[PDB]
Amino acid sequence: ATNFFIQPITEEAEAYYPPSVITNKRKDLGVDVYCCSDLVLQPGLNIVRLHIKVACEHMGKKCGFKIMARSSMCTHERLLILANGIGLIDPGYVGELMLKIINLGDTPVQIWAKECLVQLVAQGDHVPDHINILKRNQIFPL
Amino acid sequence: ATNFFIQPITEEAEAYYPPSVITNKRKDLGVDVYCCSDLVLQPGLNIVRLHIKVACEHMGKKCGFKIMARSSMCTHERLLILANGIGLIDPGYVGELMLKIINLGDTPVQIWAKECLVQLVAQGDHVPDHINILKRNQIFP
Amino acid sequence: ATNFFIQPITEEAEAYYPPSVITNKRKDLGVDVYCCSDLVLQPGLNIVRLHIKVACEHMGKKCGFKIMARSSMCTHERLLILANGIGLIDPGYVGELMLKIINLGDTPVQIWAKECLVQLVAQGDHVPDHINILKRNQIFPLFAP
Ligand SMILES: O=c1ccn([C@H]2C[C@H](O)[C@@H](COP(=O)(O)O)O2)c(=O)[nH]1
Ligand SMILES: O=c1ccn([C@H]2C[C@H](O)[C@@H](COP(=O)(O)O)O2)c(=O)[nH]1
Ligand SMILES: O=c1ccn([C@H]2C[C@H](O)[C@@H](COP(=O)(O)O)O2)c(=O)[nH]1
C-alpha cells in the first residue's frame, strides 16, 4: 500500500484541494499538484511555493518522494526547468513543498493558478493507491 | 524478472530495431534507444520522436519506466538537456515515446540517426533481464 | 540492507573523507558528497572530478545508484544544473565518479572544496543504513566490476 497525503496550507490552495480521497485506478506513477496562485516567473531562478504539506507512505511507514516536471511544464513559449533536475524529498521533511524553477528565456513568463507544472512520485516509483487531500484545519499526520 | 518490449513504428526505426531478444549480462540499468533519423535541433525547445512504442514488465505485470539522458547527450558543442529532467512513462501509456530537448546553445546542431541520446529505466530502477525487439507489422496486446 | 562504500582517491579528498562508518539515523535518501577541491566552472559544460570511488550494495549484492543535485547547487547568483538531469551509475562501473555540470550564466562561477553540490541515491531509492568511508591506500574488491 502506497499513499500520499496532501494538505493545503493557504486559502488559495484550499480552493484547489477540497478534502477528499482520490483513487488512482489509471495507475499513473505521478500525482499532479497545482500552482494554486498565478505566477510571473522572472528570467533565471525562481523559488516557487506549492502551498501544501505532503507526506508519502509505503507499507504503513512514512517514506520519501520525488518532484518531477510534467511534460507540459516546458513549452515553446516558456523554457522552464526544475533546477535540481528532480526534487528529492526525505521522509523526515515536514515543511511546505517548494520548487526551484529556472526560466531559461529572456522574458518573464505567466503561470496560471490551475496549472500543474510538476508531479509527485513515491520513493521507489510505487504507484499510489490513494491520494488523501486533508482539511486545512487538521493536525498534519505525524 | 524485468523485461522491456520495444516495437518500431516507422521504417526508419525498423533499420535500427531488427526483431531480436537482447540479454543484459553487463547488468546495466538503462536501455539505450536510437534517434532513428538525422535531426537538426534549433536553439530552444525541440520535439523529438523516438519512433518506438515501449512496454516494461516487472514480475509479470506491466509497469511504468523512466527516460533519462545518457552522459554523452550533452557535450561542449551540443549543450542539450531533457526539458523535463527525466521522462516519466506511466504503465497505461501505449503511444510513441517522445522527447522534449532544449538546445541551450546559440546555433542549430546536428543529431545523427545512430546516436542514443537517452536510455530507458524500469519503474523502481530494476535491472532488465531481456530487451525484446518486436516486429513492426504485428499487433501485440 | 542498503550500504554505500566511498573511497577517496586523492589527498585533497582524504581530508573530507577520513575513514569511518556513518549511520543514517535521519533515514535521509541521499548521501552528500564534497567537491574536495576548489573549482572554477566556466559558462557552459564542465566535467568535474568527485575524487572518490563509490560502491552501493543492496541485500549484500552490488547495485547501481544515482547522482542528484542538492537544492544547494543552484542559487540566484550561480545558475548550475546537472547536464544529465540525474547521473545513472551502473553496478559495472568502477572508475572515479564524475559530474557534468552546466553553468547557465555568462560568467565563471566558483565552487569551494567544502560544498556538497550533489547526493548519491541507491538504485530503487532505498534508504542507506550505513555509509562506509574507506581507507585511501588499500585496494578493495567491493569496487570490482
Ligand atoms: O525540490 C525540492 C527539493 C527539496 N525540498 C525539501 C525536501 C528536502 O528534504 C529538503 C532539503 O533539501 P536539500 O536542500 O538538502 O536539497 O528540502 C523541496 O521542498 N523541494
Ligand atoms: O519525456 C516524456 C514524458 C512523458 N511521455 C509520455 C508518457 C506519459 O505517460 C505521457 C504523459 O507524461 P506527463 O505529462 O505526465 O509527464 O506522455 C513521453 O513520451 N516522454
Ligand atoms: O553523472 C554521471 C553519469 C555517469 N557516470 C559514469 C557511470 C556510468 O556507468 C558511466 C556511463 O554513463 P552513460 O554514458 O551510460 O550515461 O559513466 C558518472 O561518472 N557520472
Author numbering:
A (entry chain A): 2 to 143
B (entry chain C): 2 to 142
C (entry chain B): 2 to 146
Paste lines from the article.
Deoxyuridine 5'-triphosphate nucleotidohydrolase (dUTPase, EC 3.6.1.23) is a ubiquitous enzyme in DNA repair that plays a key role in preventing uracil from being incorporated into DNA. dUTPases are widespread in organisms, including eukaryotes, prokaryotes, and some viruses. On the one hand, it catalyzes the cleavage of dUTP into dUMP and pyrophosphate (PPi), which reduces the possibility that dUTP will be incorporated into DNA through DNA polymerase. Herein, we determine the crystal structures of ASFV dUTPase and swine dUTPase in both their ligand-free and ligand-bound forms.
The crystal of the aDUT-dUMP complex grew in the P212121 space group with two trimers consisting of six subunits in each asymmetric unit. All of the subunits in the asymmetric unit have essentially identical structures, although the C terminus lacks clear electron density. In the aDUT-dUMP complex structure (postreaction state), (i) dUMP tightly bound to key amino acids in aDUT in the same manner as dUPNPP, Met99 was responsible for pairing with the uracil ring, and Tyr94 was responsible for the recognition and stabilization of deoxyribose; (ii) α-phosphates interact with Arg71 and Ser72; and (iii) the C terminus (motif V) returned to an open state, which is very conducive to product release. Comparison of the postreaction state and quiescent state showed an RMSD of 0.364 Å for the active sites, suggesting that the conformational changes are also beneficial to the release of the product. The magnesium ion (charge 2+) might facilitate PPi discharge since it is more likely to bind PPi (charge −4) than dUMP (charge −2).
